Curated annotation (Swiss-Prot), chain A:
The lineage of its organism: Viruses, Duplodnaviria, Heunggongvirae, Uroviricota, Caudoviricetes. Intermediate/inner baseplate protein. The gp25-(gp6)2-gp7 module is involved in sheath contraction. Involved in the tail assembly. Belongs to the T4likevirus baseplate wedge protein gp7 family. Heterotrimer with gp6; assembles as a (gp6)2-gp7 heterotrimeric molecule. The (gp6)2-gp7 heterotrimeric molecule further interacts with gp25 and gp53. The gp25-(gp6)2-gp7 module is involved in sheath contraction. Interacts with gp8. Binds to gp10 homotrimer; disulfide-linked. Heteromultimer with gp10; a gp10 molecule is disulfide-linked to gp7 and the other two remaining gp10 molecules form a disulfide bond. This is Baseplate wedge protein gp7. It is found in: Virion.
Swiss-Prot record, chain B:
The chain holds residues 1 to 51 of 602 of the full protein. Coiled coil: none annotated. The gene is 10. Peripheral baseplate protein that is part of the tail fiber network. Connects the short tail fibers to the baseplate. During infection, the baseplate undergoes a conformational change from a dome-shaped to a star-shaped structure. At this point, gp10 rotates and acts as a lever that unfolds the short tail fibers, which then interact with host cell surface receptors. Involved in the tail assembly. This is Baseplate wedge protein gp10. Belongs to the T4likevirus baseplate wedge protein gp10 family. It is found in: Virion.
Length: 49, 51
């Protein structure tokens, strides 16, 4: 008693961004690069258009 | 400007150009060597000039 007081109000917000973020899945690939600079020799043929 | 097409060194080695870049390094090569002398599809033994 005997005192007033003055009141300012505030607010905060608590939010998860990251839980949604993840890495889904990772994949890779196997390739045969045609550079020239080769002989055939092993095997033959095989895949034929 | 001849658009010379490399392959690396010895056969079977890692280094070489490409099959893919084989083309258009080779094809544009045709054109230019052609295009001055040829003008179009066909070469001119008599030569070709450009207006």
């Amino acid at each position: 008693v005997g005192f007033g007081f003055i009141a300012i109000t505030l607010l905060t917000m608590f939010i998860n961004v990251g839980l949604t973020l993840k890495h889904t899945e990772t994949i890779i690939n196997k390739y045969k690069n045609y550079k020239w600079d080769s002989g055939l020799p092993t095997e033959y043929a095989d895949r034929i258009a | 400007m001849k658009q010379n097409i490399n392959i690396g060194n010895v056969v079977d080695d890692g280094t070489g150009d490409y099959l893919r870049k084989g083309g258009i390094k080779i094809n544009e090569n045709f054109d230019e060597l052609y295009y001055e002398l040829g003008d179009g599809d066909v070469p001119y033994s008599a030569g070709a000039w450009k207006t």
